[PDB]
Amino acid sequence: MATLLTTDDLRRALVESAGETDGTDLSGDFLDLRFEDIGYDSLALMETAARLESRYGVSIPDDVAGRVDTPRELLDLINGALAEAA
């Protein structure tokens, strides 16, 4: 569905894009945590966006994904696209 995503939707993707058995703490309100701090270089960050693209019907440009600092922004990229996909 093109139903606007929440913190947890983003979380789910951020687990999947990270790897497997991710010993970290990424939930609640991680929106202000910079990708660099949470083990996100940018390729895995694109991985997040790309997965959300196919799943929710959005599309996220490459240079944008490798530009956003915080998950807040990435979530908003998705939600902005979802609003257009509604």
Swiss-Prot record:
Origin superkingdom: Bacteria
Occurrences of domain Carrier (ranges): 4-82
Known role: Acyl carrier protein.
GO BP: antibiotic biosynthetic process; lipid A biosynthetic process
Protein name (Swiss-Prot/TrEMBL): Actinorhodin polyketide synthase acyl carrier protein
Disulphides: none
Gene3D superfamilies (UniProt xref): ACP-like
Pathway(s) per entry: Antibiotic biosynthesis; actinorhodin biosynthesis
